[PDB]
Amino acid sequence: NPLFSPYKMGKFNLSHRVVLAPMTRCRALNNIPQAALGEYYEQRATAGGFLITEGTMISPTSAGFPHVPGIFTKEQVREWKKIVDVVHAKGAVIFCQLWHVGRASHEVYQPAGAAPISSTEKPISNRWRILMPDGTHGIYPKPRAIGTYEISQVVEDYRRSALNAIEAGFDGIEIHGAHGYLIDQFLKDGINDRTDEYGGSLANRCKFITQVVQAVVSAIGADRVGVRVSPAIDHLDAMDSNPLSLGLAVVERLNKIQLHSGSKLAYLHVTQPEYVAYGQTEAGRLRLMRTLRNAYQGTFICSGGYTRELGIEAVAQGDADLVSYGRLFISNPDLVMRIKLNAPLNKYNRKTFYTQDPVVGYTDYPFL
Amino acid sequence: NPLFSPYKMGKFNLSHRVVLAPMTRCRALNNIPQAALGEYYEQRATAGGFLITEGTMISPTSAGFPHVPGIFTKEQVREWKKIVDVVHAKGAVIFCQLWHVGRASHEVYQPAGAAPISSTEKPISNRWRILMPDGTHGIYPKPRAIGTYEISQVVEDYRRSALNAIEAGFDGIEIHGAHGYLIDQFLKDGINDRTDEYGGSLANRCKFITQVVQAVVSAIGADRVGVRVSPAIDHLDAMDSNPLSLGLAVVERLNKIQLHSGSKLAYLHVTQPEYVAYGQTEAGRLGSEEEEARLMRTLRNAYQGTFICSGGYTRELGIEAVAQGDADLVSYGRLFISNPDLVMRIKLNAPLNKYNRKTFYTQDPVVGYTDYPFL
Ligand SMILES: Cc1cc2nc3c(=O)[nH]c(=O)nc-3n(C[C@H](O)[C@H](O)[C@H](O)COP(=O)(O)O)c2cc1C
Ligand SMILES: Cc1cc2nc3c(=O)[nH]c(=O)nc-3n(C[C@H](O)[C@H](O)[C@H](O)COP(=O)(O)O)c2cc1C
């Protein structure tokens, strides 16, 4: 089983290729990592396995879900350290994903009820819903388009949070630049209508992610930075007129950061749409992952719809070096050992993805 | 087995609940029903079974796939007549689906290379593609928003086409009001941005489908008219802000049409929404749990008459739908492509042939069309 062949991810010696994908779970009450997170990541940790945390706030403005952890305060750092220590005692490697939602927030999640910040003043459409703190669903408001200087302060929030993640003991960080959140609000020409130097051209639209990655590379080293994008996922109205060309532009800039710095990023991580969908429609079904992998010099993590079989095929055929798993890792704490043994996998319950119970739907999925 | 209890679809006594879902197959070269269509439908016909044809053009502007049949000319009527004959000879009931694609077309499919027509001037976005005549995937262009007063001319196209269909011997017609096509482009508030009497309110957005159904009911009789909608479908950018309320508003208008005509429609046919697409994201499923759970039954319970569910059904799922009361009839698409004798295979609980998507829309009169094997 090629999923259980070792992989050197820069300095990190992984014993298998099964990765915990980053998953918001909303158990970090009051934006403070709670003991339950320690239990949850401990359950999924394996010797030489790679974990990526749920998306984690870089600033007071970065949240658009309830009870999601931050790492922008010393208080947050201290509680994360207890979690990281427990993961490290099992021999796991763990990265903190740094998450700014940009316009995918709501006044209830913002200081002083200020407008969420974004590349644009355009709101997510009423297609989509935000999870409100009462468990109801709400409507995304109009964001405020941030100015040129402000963009550098947000870059600084990523830099300082990466330092905070090293202070907590994390092995590294991941830049959440996917799924229509703040970085993707700059990348996607369906969102970014700026007419300053961050908008228009492909090169301009990649400035923001290039600045973020470069700042965190300078702070903690490239080999402790992974970068996650999703050029073909249009979640939260995040469409690009040309996903292949946007993805290649990002890849070229990541390669260039590596060449300029003289170092290798931990990895590029790309989420794919589930192409099994729309099979029942007339035109719904009428190369990309692998083109991006081919163009990228370094470690590639694929994600989105993967199964044991699909993961095995991805590694064996060289589409990816590592395979991250989300929903199946929610319901299978011992996912790695089940994949190793080909044991049947527990079903997952969407209803408790985002609830606050520290046990139910969180740590009470059974082991083999 | 509840799938094989009989059912009175109004005028038509059916011997079982397994229905051939309408499926575009692009074998009707140059929009003429071909002899291949006769063999294909005859293969799937059973005594007392119901078939719905592939979407069929109502006018020169109504197509957005290659080699789909029309029924807007008497030459087409003559050729359909022969296909209907061989289906009737096997004791099946067959409806012709009247399909206008609206903006889901391309200049190559339009007379004189003109713009496709729609409720709006907004094109389907770049995330969707059209099948070109050569089998490449092309870009949906900018449509022309039809005038307030030309809407009645398209309504007339449905009327004349419905009369042609029954003239060919069809037991009736189904209005394709689903999947982002012309009717749905008036229905869905993600598409219909009109400022006239056909846009804005929910009432206004239902005007087009109401007038289409009332014209065909008036021409051919209510019990020969089926109506297909898909309030909750991700296809060709056909989003509505409130799918359950859109669906209920449409049902209400059909109930009203039935009360005024004094007779029930043949059925309401509803495509089940799918929820695979965004299950992998952070927020993609968030406003949709209640719709997944209950949209289909709620529409069914609201409608005075026969309900056909469609979308993802299997033998087990189809049995449950009927046993549970969620549907009266269950339509199958892709399993019917690959199993000419699907009804018998479902009856006997036999193995089912796999379907090959690569030959769904090719022009071959045999390969991937009539050469799937019987038991
Ligand atoms: C409940 C849930 C929470 C998620 N939270 C995040 C997140 O915080 N950051 C992120 O980049 N992706 C997030 N994702 C996407 C996953 O990291 C991953 O790409 C996806 O689950 C992989 O597809 P799979 O579930 O089929 O394995 C989340 C997905 C789910 C289902
Ligand atoms: C190749 C193909 C062609 C289709 N053409 C039509 C059509 O012309 N009219 C329509 O209303 N639905 C059409 N559909 C949707 C089907 O009628 C039906 O709703 C769907 O196939 C049911 O799901 P199933 O395939 O899982 O049984 C088509 C589906 C496919 C796969």
Author numbering:
A (entry chain A): 10 to 295, 303 to 384
B (entry chain B): 10 to 384
Sentences from the study reporting this entry:
Jasmonates are phytohormones that are pivotal in mediating plant responses to various biotic and abiotic stresses and regulating plant growth. The first crystal structure of OPR3 from tomato (SlOPR3) showed that the enzyme crystallized as a self-inhibitory dimer in which the L6 loop, a critical loop involved in substrate recognition and coenzyme binding, from each protomer intrudes into the active site cavity of the other protomer. Based on these observations, it was postulated that the formation of the self-inhibitory homodimer represents a mechanism for regulating OPR3 activity and, thereby, jasmonic acid biosynthesis.
